[PDB]
Every structure is written in structure tokens, then in C-alpha cells.
């Protein structure tokens with residue numbers, strides 16, 4: 743199906759009230775609870791510096807796409823976390839679309 747993008751243009755504030763709990767997108771920002779996400783799309787599944795998490799499912803030599811990330815940002819946990827905690831849907835569908843886009847443009 744289509745991916746929609748920059749609709750509410752709240753994504754960057756959604757992040758601040760969703761992801762900021764656990765992560766940053768600042769330039770090599772602090773690995774607060776999970777790692778920083780700077781250029782996470784243009785990286786792979788967790789070639790984060792520093793934060794040597796377990797991330798077996800994550801790794802599976804995977805790339806991060808707006809889709810793949812949106813899925814990881816959609817389902818309430820279940821994505822084999824182990825590590826600790828995943829949360830899923832921000833609150834709405836269009837929010838996820840917004841978020842992914844903003845966090846795309848933020849660092850890709």
C-alpha cells in the first residue's frame with residue numbers, strides 16, 4: 743500500500759513525546775535507554791556505536807527503511823525485544839506516517 747508522509751508535521755514532536763523516552767536523533771546524541779538513531783536508515787539494524795545490545799532479531803543483516811521502521815513503530819511489542827521494552831503505535835496511523843517521515847528527514 744502507499745506510505746503517506748508529512749501530514750500533521752507533528753512527527754518531530756511526536757518523537758519528543760514517544761522516542762525521546764528511550765532514544766535520541768541528535769548528532770551522535772546520548773544512547774539514553776536505547777541507542778541514538780542518527781542516520782539509522784542509512785546504516786543497518788543497529789550498527790550503533792557504544793550500546794552493545796543483544797538485538798539478534800534486529801540484526802539479521804537488515805536495513806532500516808521507512809516501512810520496516812514503521813512496522814517496528816506499529817505493533818505493540820512482540821518484535822522479539824529481549825533487551826527490555828518496545829511500545830508500538832505512537833497513538834494513530836497518520837502519526838506513524840508523520841513520525842517516520844520527520845525522523846527520515848531529520849537524519850536522512
Ligand code: HEC
Nearest residue numbers: 760761763764776777782788790815823825826827828829
Ligand atoms: C523505550 C521504552 C523505547 C521506546 C519508547 C522506543 N524504543 Fe526504539 N528501541 C528500544 C529498545 C530497547 C530497542 C532494542 C530492541 C527492543 O525492542 O528492545 C529499540 C530499537 C529501536 C530501533 C532499532 C535498533 C536501534 O539501533 O535502535 C529503532 C530504529 C528504534 N528503536 C526507533 C525508535 C523510535 C523512532 C521510537 C519512537 C517512535 C522508539 N524507538 C521508541 C526502546 C524503545
